[PDB]
Amino acid sequence: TQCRLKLLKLERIKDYLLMEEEFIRNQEQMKPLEEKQEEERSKVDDLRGTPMSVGTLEEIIDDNHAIVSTSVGSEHYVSILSFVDKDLLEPGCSVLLNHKVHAVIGVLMDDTDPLVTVMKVEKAPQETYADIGGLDNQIQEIKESVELPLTHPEYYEEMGIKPPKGVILYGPPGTGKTLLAKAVANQTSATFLRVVGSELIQKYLGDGPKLVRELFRVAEEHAPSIVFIDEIDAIGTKRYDSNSGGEREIQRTMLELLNQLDGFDSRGDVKVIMATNRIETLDPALIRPGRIDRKIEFPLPDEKTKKRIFQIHTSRMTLADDVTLDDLIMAKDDLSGADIKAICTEAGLMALRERRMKVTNEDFKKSKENVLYKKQEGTPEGLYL
């Protein structure tokens, strides 16, 4: 609190000085730039010809040509002349063409995919590491399997042969499978692409094998990388029609995965991380190793583990030092992560009704008896069963 504060105040102030110093450089201070670069720009823009019509640079031919596809609608076989070199152009990028007669002027700009924008979500877990404790042994494993062959090459090189190519995170929700993928990805800072399994089965047919191959192929280009496939139970569970359920849809998606991961087309040291809450839906071929390598199983929380699982939920909320953990272990046990989330939410819910804007032991206790009953009730009790 007070110990932190002097340094915090200083960091914000160091950053202020940094902002203010930029303004003086762009406006007044020049030495190599001068009036001279201003004129270089004018002279280059007029020769270059504004508007510049966008193209995409697929590949460069060394003889003073390039093969461009103009983005207007009809492609052109241009020359590489005027303010760029063959090597200065880079593949899969957006380039400037002279509008009057198309020769490729150059690459200032890069082209991002339309696909990647939607898929992508930023890397960082909202529950900090070493506070996703509780099955603490398990948390370590993912750091070893996906993160490590990319972070540290030393062990792998001495070990020899093929590295890992995935992990599968499975078992009851609430043991934090999403938080783990995000941690390793954060650390490496490998582009984290994220798609829910339900996108694999949508109304249009063959979208599933299509999305998954494009997603991977994009991961290889933007490599090293982490692909997260969140909650692949949907394949069978969902259908918009007869064609969208059933064997053709289920097979095509599974079949694509098999070729993509270790098969002919392969992948680099790009890892796929799969979250699944049921491996009942998943086959023995995607639970096969060497395209999954170590599988991580989370079991139901143990009596001692349950106290550590409860702490994580309590940390996101307000920090308890007045909750009796024994009462929770005594009342229910060998119930999911999801049950510990259920006790927490219900306490917050009763406090909300009063307009009490805290949770205390009292809110946890009052809600706790109804929640245990409620767990059993969630699955049918019928008339009187």
Partner: protein, 396 residues
């Protein structure tokens, strides 16, 4: 940690905001990307603007029609999707303008300036073929009989068609690959491709079937034609249960999609002209789950056996996997191989690798015999169980 997380959250927020302004503002600051060697090229570039032959428009020649009255007529499809008929190149050979060949034609005059390298006629077929690596026999377990037939059938007629003439048969049009999965079939397939110096083109059956059927038909035909241009090639169709599944068509299911794509492939197998020395290799679980209709046995030739490793058989794969790897061991390859039940090759291969991951856990950096012993017990249980559907009731 509730009070501690807010402090940190605010401090980042402020520093992050300020950054937005600095980045935008600095930019590249009115510089030129080309630098000094392109200055001479600017002067050229201007001459070209005056010129009518620049810019060229890429197109493709769709069809050859003669009613010649100047110099040979060709109909090309422009990428604004207007058809135009153009004529023989200004100085280049007529033998460079062909059907399914790419050509550069003038934007302002529309006559063939220069022909270009061929193929861009399908959009989809170009997408369906993917990257090619090579892995060698060392890396793929076993020197067994099952391994040996793959080479003899694929490598020998394509490498030397001479041998196949001597016997008095043609080099296979078709070749069949069968064996249950998790045996390293794809791995073995990559390994023969390097030796033969026969290009392998990998293909996925899941791309072929699509919502409206017909795309997969044109794709398959175009795909055979491309391969036909290549000499001593293999079209390897991986993971197919479209061109690979059961023969049956429901008539309101995704089964329609399968049946069009299979049906063109039958036409291709025979060919418009035969396919002596061209191999298509197809992977199926076993030949009894493959069509009796797409399988018209004379053309397909040999069926190459691969089978699920035996207890002896897995003893053999495990020495290759271990030897390739860098490992320090005291315990032997046979013991651990007998330790495994009959299941798949894949569990037994993972042991060799898992012993290396236990070494990092153990706080070594290379494996030891105890890591090895630990790996068999966990691995046999893990991969085999906790998988597969819990129903085989009410399916077709």
């Amino acid at each position: 940690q509730s009070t501690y997380s807010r402090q940190i959250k605010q401090v980042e927020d402020d520093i992050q905001q300020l950054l937005k302004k600095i980045n935008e503002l600095t930019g590249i600051k009115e510089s030129d990307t080309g630098l000094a060697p392109p200055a001479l090229w600017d002067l050229a570039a201007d001459k070209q603007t005056l010129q009518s032959e620049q810019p060229l428009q890429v197109a493709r020649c769709t069809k050859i029609i003669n009613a010649d009255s100047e110099d040979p007529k060709y109909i090309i499809n422009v990428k604004q999707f207007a058809k135009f008929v153009v004529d023989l190149s200004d100085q280049v050979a007529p033998t460079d303008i062909e059907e399914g060949m790419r050509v550069g034609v003038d934007r302002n005059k529309y006559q063939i300036h220069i022909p270009l390298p061929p193929k861009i006629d399908p959009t989809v077929t170009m997408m369906q073929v993917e990257e090619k690596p090579d892995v060698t026999y060392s890396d793929v377990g076993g020197c067994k009989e099952q391994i040996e037939k793959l080479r003899e059938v694929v490598e020998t007629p394509l490498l030397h068609p001479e041998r196949f003439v001597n016997l008095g048969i043609e080099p296979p049009k078709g070749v069949l690959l069968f064996g249950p999965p998790g045996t390293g079939k794809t791995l073995c397939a990559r390994a023969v491709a390097n030796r033969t110096d026969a290009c392998f083109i990998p293909v996925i059956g899941s791309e072929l079937v699509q919502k409206y059927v017909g795309e997969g038909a044109r794709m398959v035909r175009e795909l055979f034609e491309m391969a036909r241009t290549k000499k001593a090639c293999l079209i390897f169709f991986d993971e197919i249960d479209a061109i690979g599944g059961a023969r049956f068509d429901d008539g309101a299911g995704g089964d329609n999609e399968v049946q069009r794509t299979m049906l063109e492939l039958i036409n291709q197998l025979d060919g418009f002209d035969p396919r002596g020395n061209i191999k298509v290799l197809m992977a199926t679980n076993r030949p009894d789950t493959l069509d009796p209709a797409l399988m018209r046995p004379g053309r397909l030739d040999r069926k190459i056996e691969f089978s699920l490793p035996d207890l002896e058989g897995r003893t053999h794969i495990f020495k290759i996997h271990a030897r390739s790897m860098s490992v320090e061991r005291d315990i032997r390859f046979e013991l651990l191989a007998r330790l495994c039940p009959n299941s798949t090759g894949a569990e037994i291969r993972s042991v060799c690798t898992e012993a290396g991951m236990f070494a990092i856990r153990a706080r070594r950096k290379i494996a030891t015999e105890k890591d090895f012993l630990e790996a068999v017990n966990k691995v046999i249980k893990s991969y085999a169980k906790f998988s597969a559907t819990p129903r085989y009731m009410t399916y077709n």
